[PDB]
A and B are shown apart, each in its own frame.
Chain A
Amino acid sequence: GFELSKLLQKEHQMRKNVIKHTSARHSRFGGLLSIQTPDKTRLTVSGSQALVDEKIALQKLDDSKKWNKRIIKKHQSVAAEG
């Protein structure tokens, strides 16, 4: 129970850091933000937590892309041997 209480404290701190990023309102509560670089441009992100801080908005703009690079895998050839 001692180690269990410490694991729940660690889980509570990680859950608090997760729900910092979580929007306070619901999902359909639509918030659109236009960020500009000092080179004048308009980039639109959709979120409520990303409205206030720049880093969550830039993490959204990084995460909104659907193209992923190839990561080659060794395919775990150790299991082929007995």
Chain B
Amino acid sequence: ALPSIQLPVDYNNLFNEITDFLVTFKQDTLSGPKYMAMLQKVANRELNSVIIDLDDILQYQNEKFLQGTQADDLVSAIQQNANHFTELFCRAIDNNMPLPTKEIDYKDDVLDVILNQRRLRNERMLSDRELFPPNLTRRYFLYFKPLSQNAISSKPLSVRQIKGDFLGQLITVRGIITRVSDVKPAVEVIAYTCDQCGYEVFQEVNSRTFTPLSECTSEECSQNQTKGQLFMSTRASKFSAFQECKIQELSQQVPVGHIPRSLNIHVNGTLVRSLSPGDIVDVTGIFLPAPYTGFKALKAGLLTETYLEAQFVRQHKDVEERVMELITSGDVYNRLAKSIAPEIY
């Protein structure tokens, strides 16, 4: 049914490498660990975007080589499968979350009050005279930045050069964005409340569709086996700013006699709304497939679409002293007339 194979990549050693890199690395080339300072700013609610740079990881493993030890080629493991490594980095950040150093403003956070009441539930029920998904408590959106000037993610590719072998890998594309949709909320954790037992349940979303829960699966609700009806709450649900846009192949990249192809780019979190229509941009993102559900997946079969989950977006595109230099040049009218369109006389 499901035969097993062996691969020469160890996730436990790579997780140890990540959790040592988060507390070890510091960038002194510009002139305490800087990523720990960024996670401290996350704990102080200063910033919502965490950008892991692969050039920093390559310099960290080069520094490990300078110390004499050898790494497990972490940046190649990021470039091969970035989707699992996103959650791995999120769990590494959650394992090394700093304590807040400022005012918490506890009245604004409803999920803190809910989890406080659930810990009260857990201590009361287990007094005897994971509780929450990790994406619910995450207030940070993780992104990746590719290596440069140091290697497939460094090399920019056209839309036509992206093939089926590039699924799962961090790729970089050059293109003009044709259509940008409106900013829409996409769910990640749905909270259901039981009207009888007074408990909650969280259901995680990792697909384009999801099904709701009708009855509560709580221990107290099922011990007396009352059939309490679950009610969806949007207040305690986890949301993300999702936007789908279409990127087009540049006409210089199109071969002679072909029609350019379009690719779907999905942006989530704090990277939303930076994309603009008619803008030539570089997009580095995780190239993931988009599977169907139900009858469409049964009829289309193995033939599956794809999309791009963007991680980093790069735009391709004294003044008064130059204005005074143009003044002292003299004849601004004739110079600005004859300088414009130099092919005519």
- Complex A–B touching at CB under 8 A: yes
A58 at the interface (CB under 8 A from B): no
> Which residues of the other chain, A, contact B195 by a CB distance below 8 angstroms?
44-46, 61, 64
9-residue interface stretch from A2-10, A12-20, A35-43, A73-81:
A35-43
Q: Tell me which residues from 178 to 224 in chain B have a Cβ below 8 Å from any Cβ of chain A.
A: 193-196, 198
> Which residues of the other chain, B, contact A61 by a CB distance below 8 angstroms?
195
Interchain nearest-CB distance for A68 vs B (Å)? 12
A67 at the interface (CB under 8 A from B): yes
Q: Tell me which residues from 44 to 81 in chain A have a Cβ below 8 Å from any Cβ of chain B.
A: 44-46, 61, 64-67
A65 touches which one: B198, B226, B233 (CB < 8 A)?
A: B226
A43 touches which one: B120, B198, B233, B235 (CB < 8 A)?
A: B198
* Contact, CB under 8 Å: B193 / A44: yes
Interchain nearest-CB distance for B206 vs A (Å)? 26
| Nearest B residue (CB) for A60 | B195
> Which residues of the other chain, A, contact B198 by a CB distance below 8 angstroms?
34, 41-44
Given A32-B193, A43-B198: A67 in contact with B227 (beta carbons within 8 A) = yes
| Nearest A residue (CB) for B194 | A44
B40 at the interface (CB under 8 A from A): no
* Contact, CB under 8 Å: B193 / A64: no
| Nearest B residue (CB) for A34 | B198
Interface range for A = 10 to 19
Q: Tell me which residues from 214 to 251 in chain B have a Cβ below 8 Å from any Cβ of chain A.
A: 226-229, 231, 233, 235
* A-B contacts at CB below 8 angstroms, number: 29
> Which residues of the other chain, A, contact B16 by a CB distance below 8 angstroms?
none
B96 at the interface (CB under 8 A from A): no
* Contact, CB under 8 Å: A66 / B194: no
* Contact, CB under 8 Å: A64 / B227: no
* Contact, CB under 8 Å: B120 / A65: no
Give Cα A43–Cα B199 distance, bound, in whole angstroms. Answer: 8
> Which residues of the other chain, A, contact B229 by a CB distance below 8 angstroms?
64, 66
Give Cα A34–Cα B194 distance, bound, in whole angstroms. Answer: 11
> Which residues of the other chain, A, contact B193 by a CB distance below 8 angstroms?
32, 44
Q: Tell me which residues from 87 to 142 in chain B have a Cβ below 8 Å from any Cβ of chain A.
A: 117, 120, 124
* Contact, CB under 8 Å: A46 / B231: yes
> Which residues of the other chain, A, contact B124 by a CB distance below 8 angstroms?
40
> Which residues of the other chain, A, contact B228 by a CB distance below 8 angstroms?
64
> Which residues of the other chain, B, contact A34 by a CB distance below 8 angstroms?
198
| Nearest A residue (CB) for B232 | A30
* Contact, CB under 8 Å: B231 / A65: no
Interchain nearest-CB distance for B167 vs A (Å)? 41
> Which residues of the other chain, A, contact B231 by a CB distance below 8 angstroms?
44, 46
Given A42-B198, A44-B193: A66 in contact with B227 (beta carbons within 8 A) = yes
Interchain nearest-CB distance for A63 vs B (Å)? 10
Q: Chain A residues in contact with chain B, CB under 8 A? A: 32, 34, 40-46, 61, 64-67
10 A-B pairs with CB atoms under 8 Å apart are: A32-B193, A34-B198, A41-B198, A42-B117, A42-B198, A44-B194, A46-B231, A61-B195, A64-B195, A65-B196
12 further interface pairs, Cβ-Cβ under 8 Å (given A34-B198, A65-B196, A66-B227)? A40-B124, A44-B193, A44-B194, A44-B195, A46-B231, A61-B195, A64-B195, A64-B196, A64-B228, A65-B226, A66-B229, A67-B226
